[PDB]
Write a protein that binds this ligand. Structure first.
Ligand SMILES: CC(C)(COP(=O)(O)OP(=O)(O)OC[C@H]1O[C@@H](n2cnc3c(N)ncnc32)[C@H](O)[C@@H]1OP(=O)(O)O)[C@@H](O)C(=O)NCCC(=O)NCCSC(=O)CCC(=O)O
Ligand SMILES: CC(C)(COP(=O)(O)OP(=O)(O)OC[C@H]1O[C@@H](n2cnc3c(N)ncnc32)[C@H](O)[C@@H]1OP(=O)(O)O)[C@@H](O)C(=O)NCCC(=O)NCCSC(=O)CCC(=O)O
Ligand SMILES: Cc1ncc(COP(=O)(O)O)c(C=O)c1O
Ligand SMILES: *Cc1c(COP(=O)(O)O)cnc(C)c1O
Lengths: 399, 398
């Protein structure tokens, strides 16, 4: 039994499918987002523009976020030094959980070291709290959701993406006494489309199911207080559990769930993924809390307005260059190439020729045959930045 | 169903077993560790001494760690803004990974958002890279290891804690052509005992198995450079994969594995837990890197010598007092109470009556019937401090 052989086989398999990923070493320039320094593999340094990042509103450089972080470092040190149970519970975590509960108008919130962990731990743990739980999952749910859903044995049903008629057909066929939970996303990361929240909620109420929504690509960005798409549509009260991140629009790190005190307490008491891990550094919690708080204000709205419009302008200018990109009406702008090697070929050209950094997206992040570039215009991608990008794209494609 | 009823039943169940956990809201005072402010449930504030923390060497307040963190915040901002693939790979992560690789004298290292995630992702992904892998796991392995080992379907064998005779018996009975991996800890968090690294490595070599060691409660603290117990015993070259944390003795946050470039690249390319999650904030990576680098030096050794001795003194003083204290020769000092409700009472009294904070440890962190207090003396727990605690436990006790 030669372990190295097997490793080589597994690696070679990636190259043969043209999906081996090469990371890009960068350093974002605080105060000058979206500018970053690219550390080229040949040791050189090049100024670049980040066009595919997930700090959607540039909160990673916001002076109020950084002030809160610098203060916390000075007050309590670098980390918490423990799990939530063994000394790692700080006022910074309580405040942050209250801030999140308030955002989603829920009794409680629970903070994990990432939205990934939150989804994985919570979905799996619910199978333990609700013996016989059947989980209905949107075919394009995120990996973390799929992972949580499968982790522990138990019934799952996958419904065709956004297909509520399929959802209802599946659920009506199931044992009417079984606990049921429907898990889906408000904004899907790669297509940039919206989940039909009202219709799913309607189905959940009709069949007595819990609803679980991942608003990871929505929080900070939609709704008058940045609480997400359900807030935008006035449906937050119809959602049982919210899952969110503090690492994207909020610009820091970590994730959470928000739900009733009963739900939060059960999860925190039973989920190994919550119990057995060091709690988030107080400075992270400080920064994230400041971010959420800020984005709840009229000043936050300004950032959302600017993002919406920059996205709208970019899409307009790209279609005008004779470029069909499917515009599902969100802030995410995907350009589908449809082959992983072309996708990297094109991404290499933007990077080197133009300083436009947009990572090539392939399997398993997107289905095979749907590989793409994924632009994420933020408030800091000003009108001239946009014009810069379109002229790059035009000049590129004129090859 | 009625979902609220089931939740109540699940919560009531905790109370009935006397294991419902009440968290303690604290704020450590940077520059004055182990002092912290306890935010009492009644709104009051009280000065306390942390005695159960995992920032084992007080690196959480170290000026070089904090300097690097402040610097990074100013250079690149609050977070990375992406997954490792989508813009989240920074020079700070590369440097950190190299720093860790060097620590364990391995070709490569891979950083996850926690040692938990590292264990869970790696152990499960290994089943995918080595079809038919049989994993042999110490009965007292950490939850994260257990979670990783069972995540994907596949053979597992649990050996009685530290029992190498049992390990060998199990492994000799299995198909001799199957890929095998043995997974164990160098220091077990709750007993404070040591894994028999040499004997396990010997078995591994004899039966052609990979060795996977979790040194989470050892890195920064054992070996001349703080690389752990395998470094201490000159066994680092016989270990295939190391798992470690940046959140305990290193004083920051996050975890990692260290192994060959091949091993790291395979895991990185196949593990959903690595792929689909935002990368560690550059400031966290900056701080951790500074921490490891510092603890590699003679000045780091000073902190280890101080910790070892404070631990030695505390155990001596507690035996002297007649406490029920298990001593397996590590820096962890467990006092077994053996009942989750009395463990809470003793702990509650200690806090509100004497400003001593030592969380009651119950199931599922430790087996039922073995609930306990777990003292973690650090270099900042000076001789006066120790004197303070012993006097308090004596007065208790009564
Ligand atoms: C290949 C597929 C399409 C599904 O087939 P697999 O390759 O997993 O085959 P397999 O693992 O043997 O089969 C999948 C197992 O998981 C289950 N499964 C598959 N899809 C599911 C869904 N939507 N909901 C619930 N369960 C699902 C199957 O029933 C099966 O479980 P059983 O066998 O037990 O029945 C999946 O891997 C995938 O495409 N995932 C996409 C992940 C995603 O959406 N990522 C968003 C990226 S956003 C991001 O963070 C970017 C990241 C980056 O690149 O940096
Ligand atoms: C009593 C135990 C040992 C667990 O007893 P359980 O009854 O839960 O075990 P179980 O029901 O058998 O668990 C179910 C599945 O897990 C498997 N399983 C159990 N132990 C295993 C091991 N060592 N390796 C691999 N698999 C294992 C079983 O085979 C089983 O599958 P089958 O039954 O189908 O065979 C307790 O000590 C525990 O689980 N502790 C968690 C790990 C730990 O030591 N954590 C301390 C971390 S210190 C920390 O992080 C601090 C934290 C804090 O408190 O905040
Ligand atoms: C829908 C969804 N949920 C969760 C995650 C992971 O979030 P986090 O960075 O907080 O681990 C991703 C982001 O990559 C995602 O696309
Ligand atoms: C606490 C613990 C972990 C988790 O480490 P984090 O970095 O805090 O996730 C992993 N292994 C062991 C043995 C632990 O005690």
């Amino acid at each position: 039994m030669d372990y190295n052989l097997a490793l080589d086989k597994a690696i070679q398999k990636l190259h043969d499918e043209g999906r081996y990923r090469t990371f890009i070493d960068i350093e974002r320039e605080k105060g000058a987002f979206p500018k970053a320094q690219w550390n080229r593999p040949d040791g050189g340094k090049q100024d670049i523009t980040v066009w595919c990042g997930n700090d959607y509103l540039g909160m990673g450089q916001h002076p109020v976020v950084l002030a809160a972080m610098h203060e916390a470092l000075e007050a309590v040190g670098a980390g918490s030094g423990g799990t939530r149970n063994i000394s790692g519970t700080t006022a910074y975590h309580r405040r942050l959980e209250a801030e999140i509960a308030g955002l989603h108008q829920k009794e409680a919130a629970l903070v994990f070291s990432s939205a990934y962990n939150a989804n994985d731990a919570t979905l799996s743990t619910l199978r333990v709290l609700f013996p016989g739980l059947i989980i209905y999952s949107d075919s394009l749910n995120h990996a973390s959701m799929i992972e949580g859903i499968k982790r522990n044995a138990g019934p799952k049903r996958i419904f065709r993406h956004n297909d509520v008629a399929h959802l209802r057909e599946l659920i009506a066929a199931d044992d009417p006494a079984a606990p049921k939970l429907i898990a889906f996303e408000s904004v899907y990361s790669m297509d940039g489309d919206f989940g039909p929240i009202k219709e799913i909620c309607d189905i959940a109420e009709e069949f007595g199911a819990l609803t679980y929504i991942d608003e990871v690509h929505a929080v900070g960005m939609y709704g008058p207080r940045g609480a997400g798409v359900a807030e935008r549509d006035g449906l937050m009260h119809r959602i049982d559990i919210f899952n969110g991140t503090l690492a994207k629009a909020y610009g820091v790190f970590g994730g959470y769930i928000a739900a009733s005190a009963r739900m939060v307490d059960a999860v925190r008491s039973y989920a190994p993924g919550f119990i057995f891990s060091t709690s988030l550094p107080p400075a992270i919690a400080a920064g994230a809390q400041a971010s959420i708080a800020f984005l709840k204000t009229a000043e936050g709205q300004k950032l959302r307005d600017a993002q919406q419009m920059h996205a709208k302008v970019l899409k307009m200018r790209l279609k005008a260059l004779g470029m069909p990109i499917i515009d599902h009406g969100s802030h995410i702008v995907p350009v589908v190439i449809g082959d992983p090697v072309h996708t990297k070929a094109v991404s290499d050209m933007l990077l080197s020729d133009y300083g436009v950094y947009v990572q090539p997206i392939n399997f398993p992040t997107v289905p095979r045959g749907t590989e793409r570039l994924r632009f994420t215009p933020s408030p800091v991608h000003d009108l001239k930045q946009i014009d810069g990008l379109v002229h790059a794209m035009d000049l590129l494609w004129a090859r």
